Amino acid sequence: NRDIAQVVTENNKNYLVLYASQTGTAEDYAKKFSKELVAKFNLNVMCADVENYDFESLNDVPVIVSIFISTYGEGDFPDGAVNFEDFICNAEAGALSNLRYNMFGLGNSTYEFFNGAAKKAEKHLSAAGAIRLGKLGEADDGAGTTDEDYMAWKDSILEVLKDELHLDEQEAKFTSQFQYTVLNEITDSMSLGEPSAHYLPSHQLNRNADGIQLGPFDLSQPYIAPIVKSRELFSSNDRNCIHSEFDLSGSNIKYSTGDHLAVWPSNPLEKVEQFLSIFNLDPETIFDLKPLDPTVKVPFPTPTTIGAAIKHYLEITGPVSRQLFSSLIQFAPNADVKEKLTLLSKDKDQFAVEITSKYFNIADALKYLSDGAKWDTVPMQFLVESVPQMTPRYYSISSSSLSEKQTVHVTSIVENFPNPELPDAPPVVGVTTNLLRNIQLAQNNVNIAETNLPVHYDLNGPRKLFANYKLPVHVRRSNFRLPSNPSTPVIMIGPGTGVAPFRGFIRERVAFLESQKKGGNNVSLGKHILFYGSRNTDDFLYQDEWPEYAKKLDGSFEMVVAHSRLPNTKKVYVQDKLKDYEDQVFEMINNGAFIYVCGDAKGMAKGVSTALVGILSRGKSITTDEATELIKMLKTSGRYQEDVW
Ligand SMILES: Cc1cc2nc3c(=O)[nH]c(=O)nc-3n(C[C@H](O)[C@H](O)[C@H](O)COP(=O)(O)OP(=O)(O)OC[C@H]3O[C@@H](n4cnc5c(N)ncnc54)[C@H](O)[C@@H]3O)c2cc1C
Ligand SMILES: Cc1cc2nc3c(=O)[nH]c(=O)nc-3n(C[C@H](O)[C@H](O)[C@H](O)COP(=O)(O)O)c2cc1C
Ligand SMILES: Cc1cc2nc3c(=O)[nH]c(=O)nc-3n(C[C@H](O)[C@H](O)[C@H](O)COP(=O)(O)O)c2cc1C
Numbered sequence: 001n002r003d004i005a006q007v008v009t010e011n012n013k014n015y016l017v018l019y020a021s022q023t024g025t026a027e028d029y030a031k032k033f034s035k036e037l038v039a040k041f042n043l044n045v046m047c048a049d050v051e052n053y054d055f056e057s058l059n060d061v062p063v064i065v066s067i068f069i070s071t072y073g074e075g076d077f078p079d080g081a082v083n084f085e086d087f088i089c090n091a092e093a094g095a096l097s098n099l100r101y102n103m104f105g106l107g108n109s110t111y112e113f114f115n116g117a118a119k120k121a122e123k124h125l126s127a128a129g130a131i132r133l134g135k136l137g138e139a140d141d142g143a144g145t146t147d148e149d150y151m152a153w154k155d156s157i158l159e160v161l162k163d164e165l166h167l168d169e170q171e172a173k174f175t176s177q178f179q180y181t182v183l184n185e186i187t188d189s190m191s192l193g194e195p196s197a198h199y200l201p202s203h204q205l206n207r208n209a210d211g212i213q214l215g216p217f218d219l220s221q222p223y224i225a226p227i228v229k230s231r232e233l234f235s236s237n238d239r240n241c242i243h244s245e246f247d248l249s250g251s252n253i254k255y256s257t258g259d260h261l262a263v264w265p266s267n268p269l270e271k272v273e274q275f276l277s278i279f280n281l282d283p284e285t286i287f288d289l290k291p292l293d294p295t296v297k298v299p300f301p302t303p304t305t306i307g308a309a310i311k312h313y314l315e316i317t318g319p320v321s322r323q324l325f326s327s328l329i330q331f332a333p334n335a336d337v338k339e340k341l342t343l344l345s346k347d348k349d350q351f352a353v354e355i356t357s358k359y360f361n362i363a364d365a366l367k368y369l370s371d372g373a374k375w376d377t378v379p380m381q382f383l384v385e386s387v388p389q390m391t392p393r394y395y396s397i398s399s400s401s402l403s404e405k406q407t408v409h410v411t412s413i414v415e416n417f418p419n420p421e422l423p424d425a426p427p428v429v430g431v432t433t434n435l436l437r438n439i440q441l442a443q444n445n446v447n448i449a450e451t452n453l454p455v456h457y458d459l460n461g462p463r464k465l466f467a468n469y470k471l472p473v474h475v476r477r478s479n480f481r482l483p484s485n486p487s488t489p490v491i492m493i494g495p496g497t498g499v500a501p502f503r504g505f506i507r508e509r510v511a512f513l514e515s516q517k518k519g520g521n522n523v524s525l526g527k528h529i530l531f532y533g534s535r536n537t538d539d540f541l542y543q544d545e546w547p548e549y550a551k552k553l554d555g556s557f558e559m560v561v562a563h564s565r566l567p568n569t570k571k572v573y574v575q576d577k578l579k580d581y582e583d584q585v586f587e588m589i590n591n592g593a594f595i596y597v598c599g600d601a602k603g604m605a606k607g608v609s610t611a612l613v614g615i616l617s618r619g620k621s622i623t624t625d626e627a628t629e630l631i632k633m634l635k636t637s638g639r640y641q642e643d644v645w
Contacts, residue, residue, distance in 0.1 A: 004048070005057030011295050013046040016061055019068040020050040020081035020117070024391045026106045029139075029150050030068040032323050033104075035385065039172040039327075040158070041165075046295045050084040058087070064100045064133065064161065067121065071107040074635070075116020079476075085117075088124045097129035100164075102157050104137035104150065110602050111644070112609065114140070134160040142602070147321050148348060154323075174330055176381040179290035183303050186286060191301035193312035193462035195264055195472040196221040200301065201463070213251045219392065222264050222472030223251045224465060225408075230440040233411065236538035240452075241413035241497065242433070242440045245399075246473060249406040257401045257504040258480035258643075261408055262392035264472035265432040267311050268455035274363035275316045276307065279383070280376035283307025287380060299389055306380055311458060315388040317431060320365045322351050327386055328366070333373045340369055358421045359428045362387065393432040394476060396598060396643055398500035403511030408475070411500040411541065412436050416454050427454045435471075443469050480596070480643045482508060489526045489593030491585065493608050495533035495562075495574050498599020499541055501643060502530055505596075510552050525556040527588060529581075531574040535565035574604070575611040585612075586619040595640040605644045612640075 001007070008016055015037060019030035027049065034045045070078050077085040105118020115138045122136050137153030139146040162169065186192070188201035198205060198221055206215045217223040229245035246261070255261075276283060288303035300313040310316055325345035332338030344351045355365050366375055399409030414437050415430030435457045441448045442459060460466055482505050483490065492502040509525060516522050534540050540561070550557050560581060562572040578585060589595070589612075597608050609631060617627035634640035 002052070002054045003057050004053045004055055005060035007048075007053070007295065008046055008061055008063060011046065011293055012044060013295065014043040014063055015045040016048065016063050016065040017045055017068070018048050018050050018065060018084075020078050020084060021068070021070050021106075022072055022078035022080075023070070024389060025141075025146070026068040026070040026078075026104075028388045029104065029106070030066070031385075032150070032321070033066060033068070033154060035174075035327070036154070036158070036172065036323070037161075038175050040169050041162075041167045042170070042175075043167070047297075048295070051080045055084060055087045059096050059098050061099065064102075064164065066157075067101055067103040067118075069103065069105050069118045069121055071105065071111075071113065071115050071117035075113030075120055077117045077121070085121070088121055088128075091124060091128035093127060093129060095128040096125060099125070099128075099130035100133060101125065101130060102133040102137075102160070104139065104153055104157075106139045106141065106146065108141035110142035111605060114138075114142075133157070133164060147319065147323075151322055151348070172326070172330075174327065174379075174382050176379070177292055177296045177385060178298070178381055179292060180379070180381045181288045181290065181303075183286035183288060186305070187303075189303075190286065191304040191308060191462070193266070193304070193308035194301060194465060195224070195312075197301045199224070199462075199465060208252070212249075217251065217253055217474040219262070219474070222262070222392075222474045223248070223253060224461075224467075224470050225251070225473045226467065226470045227436075227439055227443065228407070228469075230436075230443050230469075232440065233541055234413075234539050236536075237452075239414065239539065240416075240437055241411065241539065241541070242436045243398075244410045244412065244436055244440070246408040246410065247406065248408055253475055254405075255397060255401050255408055255475045256477070257397070257399075257482065257508045258501055259397050259401075259478050260394045260476040261397050261410055262394050262474045262476055263410070263432055263436070264392045265390060265435050266457055266461070267314075267316055267390070267431060268429070268434065268457055269311075270426075270455050271317050271361060271363070272307070272311045274361065274367075275310050278363045278367045278370070278375055279378050280374040281306050281310070281380065281383075283310075285380070289381070289384065299384060308462065309380075309384065312462065313390055314384070315390045316363065317361045318388070320355055320360055320362055322348070324362065324386065325351070325355075325365075327382075328375075328378070331375060331378045331382070333370050333375050333377070337369050337373065344369075358425070359419050390431075392472075392474070394645075396480075396497075396500040397475075398503040400504045400507030400511055402508045404507070408473075409504070410436075411497050411503070413497050416452075429454045439469050439471075478643065479638075480598070480641055483526075483594050485526075486512070486523050487526045489588045489591050490528045490596070491588060491593050492528070492530045492596045492598075493574050493578070494530070494596075494598040495601065495604055496539070496599055497541070498597075498601070498604075498644075499530070499532050501596070501598045502532075503542055503545070506530075506549050506553070506557070509556075510549055513552065525553065527558070527593070528553065528556055529558045529560065529584070529588065531560045531562070531577050531581075533562040533564065533572070533574045533577075536563055537566075573607065575607045578608065578611045579614065582615045582618065586615050589616070590619075592639070595634065596643075597641070598643040600645055605642060 021027040105115040107115030134157045139149040225246045228247045233241045285306040395410045398411045414433040419425040564571045613627045
């Protein structure tokens, strides 16, 4: 039941496809592979999330295995795949001499340890005597080539397995892993979009004496929390960034400054409409999915309505995979479209030209090819097994648990920019962030008609479960933590929203410092310096707060702002400011300071790291390489932590 070799064998599976995915990217591609493997060779494949099984009996797997692994933190596996990571990192020599596998690693060359998880995993597997079929795939999210990278690796591996297994191909045809059934009435056991099944009327939320909602809150059961306060942090007529405050008192959730919050979204109504239209799906359709074997896991709560699935369960928005096109050939509206489609699925570049570059969503791509002709022969099952599952988006909590124990602050910059290719098309927006903004405007009685809100969301939720200004949520414990000793110096680097953690960090230090003031015994606070950065004065996050914080922390605090887009001057980054203050920074580091790097970036991570290596290199008068080794050490020990996304 958790005994991998046993599960495979008992269910007579010909192939095993494992995946270690944090955000689900690895999982979805794993599914794409599995589906195609069934479509072309009718193999009875097993899709498993590496986290749900015990790989002790891995060397007893009579079938070939495909491993899809992502890289996080250092060159390490996704949280909750460490068990797997350890079985591997501990498997002795010859411990997996029967294992035959191929692996596709998902990473991003913008980080040091690019695809290191897959690499580590490939090094230990071969160490235990496992034979590796085909080339080690490496999807580079940094170059935005992940989908094509997969297509490339995919095609070559399938050839290999065709040989290795002596399989006879066949025209690719879809085969549901479920038993689709169309119901007629809606029960209390049927979902209208509720997150986990526990929120279905016919189910009882597990609380305590005082009604406080209990149970563990994670990806398999969020906690619907209300956003009690919300405001705009920017003052730019093009960009927005929202400050959201979540009340967690109605639950036994505890968070530590430095943790992450996962916000479960829903789709923009105007996109839900586009999807439902191009296919010609009736929202009111009630359906149920019945697995065709124990290995198969229903995607979301069922039965449910088509419109609920498309609004709360499927990622109908985002870049269309070329593989989707290939899989859509079976249900082309007409011979015409079927041909155009066929071509695009095969031509890497034409696909990018006709679809990708225009920022299409499935709805758009298809409507583009059909010229409006609906794709009314596409099965909801296919759509369910073929469209990526919606997934929570994470945020660096910007509140202090010591001064907010029950409340959680989130600093999300809204994603919404003009289509670079189509000057008349709608903006390219992000679900969650625009959703958070919608709630923000709403909650504040802002006339959203005037605003630049590009889309809008169902703010009531399923059965009004989202009781105005509420959303499924769950805390994700991290390692980003302030030093134990208050005296230890601290260095915080966070461009843009990357300052979120640091706001909490400072709020923690400021809160703490208060307590000491009502207890006499004062502890001297080590030096705390912050390097922040933003375009101009309109995107200067929590501008008003820092001066107050500074007053309460006195000389223990120091902020260094940099602006990359002020008119008439030269673009300045935090790494630039790091070199300006190299003496201060070097000194602090020689005093055991801790280095914190947070934010999005695409570059900033290595940039800042490189800056420090320079500072160190000059400071201790050693080579760049030595200094690089010293920096790697500070990261291994934990004196240099990074929360870069
Ligand atoms: C550990 C961690 C911490 C984080 N902390 C923060 C934080 O503090 N603050 C913060 O703001 N974010 C943070 N993030 C990022 C955040 O989780 C999301 O990535 C961000 O909010 C985008 O959410 P969304 O719902 O708008 O994205 P999505 O809807 O998934 O959209 C992503 C992007 O793709 C674009 N897009 C949409 N459709 C298409 C298409 N068809 N083709 C191409 N592009 C398309 C969107 O416009 C958008 O820019 C963090 C992430 C992690 C993993
Ligand atoms: C917090 C965070 C840390 C990451 N660290 C690395 C890293 O060290 N190396 C790398 O190659 N990619 C890194 N990535 C990129 C992911 O591996 C990549 O986006 C992958 O597609 C994620 O797949 P998943 O969604 O299946 O987990 C990181 C991503 C995030 C969000
Ligand atoms: C053309 C194209 C198609 C893609 N198709 C998919 C897809 O079907 N499934 C998936 O998980 N990622 C797909 N990706 C990858 C995402 O764009 C990318 O990994 C992004 O970081 C995901 O962010 P998320 O965390 O919001 O999923 C595709 C990328 C491109 C460029």
